[PDB]
Design a protein around this ligand. Sequence first.
Ligand code: NA
Ligand code: NA
Ligand code: NA
Ligand code: NA
Ligand code: ZN
Ligand code: ZN
Ligand code: ZN
Ligand code: ZN
Lengths: 273, 273, 275, 275
Amino acid sequence: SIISTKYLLQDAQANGYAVPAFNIHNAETIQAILEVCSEMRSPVILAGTPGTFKHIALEEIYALCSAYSTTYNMPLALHLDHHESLDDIRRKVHAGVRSAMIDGSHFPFAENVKLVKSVVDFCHSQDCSVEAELGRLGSAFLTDPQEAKRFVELTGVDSLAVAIGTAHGLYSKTPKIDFQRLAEIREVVDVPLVLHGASDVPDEFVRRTIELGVTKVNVATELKIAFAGAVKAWFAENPQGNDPRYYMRVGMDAMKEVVRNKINVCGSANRIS
Amino acid sequence: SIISTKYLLQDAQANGYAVPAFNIHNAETIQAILEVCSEMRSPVILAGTPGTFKHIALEEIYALCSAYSTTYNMPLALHLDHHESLDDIRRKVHAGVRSAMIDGSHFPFAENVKLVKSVVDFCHSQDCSVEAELGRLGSAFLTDPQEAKRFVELTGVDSLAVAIGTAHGLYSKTPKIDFQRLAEIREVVDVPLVLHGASDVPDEFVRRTIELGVTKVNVATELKIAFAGAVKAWFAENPQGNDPRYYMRVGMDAMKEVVRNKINVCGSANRIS
Amino acid sequence: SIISTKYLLQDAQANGYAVPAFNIHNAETIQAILEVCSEMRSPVILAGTPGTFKHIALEEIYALCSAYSTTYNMPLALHLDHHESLDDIRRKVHAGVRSAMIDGSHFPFAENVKLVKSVVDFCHSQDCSVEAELGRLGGVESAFLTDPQEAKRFVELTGVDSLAVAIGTAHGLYSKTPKIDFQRLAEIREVVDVPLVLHGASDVPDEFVRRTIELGVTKVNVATELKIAFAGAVKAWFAENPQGNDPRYYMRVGMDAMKEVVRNKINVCGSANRI
Amino acid sequence: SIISTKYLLQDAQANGYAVPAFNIHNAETIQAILEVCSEMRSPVILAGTPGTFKHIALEEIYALCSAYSTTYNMPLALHLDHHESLDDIRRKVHAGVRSAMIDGSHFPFAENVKLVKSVVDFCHSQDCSVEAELGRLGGVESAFLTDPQEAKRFVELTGVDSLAVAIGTAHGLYSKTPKIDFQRLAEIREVVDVPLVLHGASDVPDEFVRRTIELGVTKVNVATELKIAFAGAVKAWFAENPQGNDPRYYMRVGMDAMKEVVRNKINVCGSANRI
Ligand code: NA
Ligand code: NA
Ligand code: NA
Ligand code: NA
Ligand SMILES: [Zn+2]
Ligand SMILES: [Zn+2]
Ligand SMILES: [Zn+2]
Ligand SMILES: [Zn+2]
């Protein structure tokens, strides 16, 4: 079963935990995530960016998730991360995806709203949930609480990505997270909040953001560093080695450690049954 | 569409070419093969051994092939290579596979026949084609023409793997292929013949075996060496690199060269439409 | 695509129309409904009861609806009407259905709530929307009329996506013009913000159904009128063609009669051109 | 699982039975056939003609058969009966069907061969088996009777998996006991080793069908008797129940009448306990 995240993030919100959202690339990266989530009874979101689908097309990622849903006996929420076009999201929703992020955050408010609204209208007709973003990751760079209230009112989005100090990738210095702004947003925004850029954020800061209303925590970079680091080590030690059953498994196992760490921080263990 | 190889190997036989049978492991290895086969208009067989499916289960390999069949607009023959048990083949055929190899070649003739026959009876009830083997790869080590005639008569197999001097893996010295024995087998066996162990066999020898009746050429080792060699080089040059879109693509591109070389030797270009 | 009705009934509520929910039986009945909904650009819900699925199993109805979704290029909402247990609903949701009605209305409040809650918990984990019922269906006393304050508490405790109300309608035909408790409906709507559902709408006057939609009905269930029209046409064909035997003729005559009902119900629900 | 009939008709040929091939229309007709085939452990072919699929489209029939395959835990062979062009067969094979009949029998030999060959070339690339016809159906001269030597050449030139013969059968009922050209059948079998197919088997005496199987028929097509039995039962129910309307009753009465025909044809074909 492939599902949206409408009920899922509401449950996270109501119970004080967040759903980890992991960016995936292929069979082994999906499987690594699901081996841990199934064991820990954690919900999960499996996400791909447009660049993801230039490597393995969505039709094949979808097919893999549909089969893995049966294999691990769990419905799965496949999610379009940082998509930017209504036409592209339409094609991908027709292909079966039921969660999308439309990211218009580098546009002025009015144009962001128009883009996002066009995506909400289509996606809700397809039973697809919609995330959008107000504020840029990394003024323009912090989400304003009253603006976020209005943004959600004009768009009808199911969840909202906020800008409170996180950034994609590694941080060169420990980030500064604006917990007071987060608290203020949560006071006036009722839809589930989303935290991007969570790789390399101290666990105590992520935990605090979930206490203050974060329902979805996105992790991409740490997964890739772990996977790749292990494959690199394996080829160094095995110059004549060539069987993916061996080298991809060492990548999977290093990635699994990160997945367990993130489930722990998100508080998502034992939230499904 | 997922299909058997019943018509496919008959066409190869009738037109003097062979179908390349490539062992696959995951999305990228399947895709690499199909990018070349679709471009060259070549039929192909995508094969997995039992160990293959311990890495990515058949249900997920099946799902990938079903999606890739649509993506490349071609029915695909997924094939169980060197399977050894009726129960396991039954499960995998129920999961959708429509070509199987039952390898009882390390058993005495009578027990090989009993095993193979049990598999033929089931598989034909499921519209699944069946390959079997008489003679061991590497006396016991060369297929006897009259024994191969009787073997096919008692089993009802759709194709027959023969032992004429090939071996799995690389050869330490140029192999000696028994072309006269092959010719003798072909005189008394009417079902399509299969050549295992084709990695590292000189092209001129494979070409001659197809002139003398080989219809299916199995290649595994050369694919893995190429893929892995390229990934290894990429990590050496990119110690901090981590995106599978980059490193898996360099593996795919090195593998594609091998795939094109094998299509050329097999004479399978422009055999589909 | 097979979908839930969560966004669908919210759009109906916000725009003051209702989605017609037609009980189906087989390919021809689904097809007749979709022919009309396609041409009138109307949303629809396709419903089956436990007894339906003892004739043609849910897996086969699901397969038909999935295929018809592609054929008509429209997501479709298949719905379990008047289902009664968690074990059965779980299998049918696992089989692909994304909208269910758990009918616990025969049981006292607390037992009703506990049953419904078990189904909502499961179904929401599957992205399946859930309808439930408080008060019993049947014309004109307390068992047969939803109490507004109980309705508020019921929806709060269970987490249902929509509520089937009991306001004087009944399954089947009415022996006399029904008395519908419009005031009660209004008072439920006052305290319940989830979409409301009207059962028993066959043979209810159009004026009355329209009024219930003005008062918050978002889903109108119709079964009996469809079967009477289908069967009546088939009856008449056989009388007219005593040697006739080709189902391509007689099932189409039945379809065409049922299509007239479907159009009439789309008209009363105000669902044309809402897609 | 949806499969071709290539191994199926070879088993029938080798064991001296025939597979019954029943024309279907919708869910109830498929279901009636599978109920009986399941209990009698008989293989079956489910067939639809172009006109069938103008009532309920192939994609929906396919979806039903796929689901029924799972429900009955048996691979099923869906078959395109009397299809006429490559463009249509290509779409229906792409839609999932793995057995087709290309009927070029209206055309002169060479045109027949060229058409059939185009379909065999395509279908075999899709793992779809192909039936074709030489000579025209209809009771008792040359157009209506397959020539053995022409049959040999036809099968050689086209590569078909099975051959529909013309030996005196006709679609529909017979106004008098048909004269079947058993000798001709034998002479075709002499020179054609691919499985043979008998069309028009409704209303042919059991003795005669049995004889054709002894002479090489591997597939027996039945349509008309199924519809007469279904419709006759529905006719009688409506007469007995002038207010009746529930399709769960009247479609089951029709099913049950058709099941009696299905049993009778399994009996004549000798296909029980061959699975
Ligand atoms: Na980060
Ligand atoms: Na080798
Ligand atoms: Na009623
Ligand atoms: Na007849
Ligand atoms: Zn992000
Ligand atoms: Zn081998
Ligand atoms: Zn009702
Ligand atoms: Zn016919």
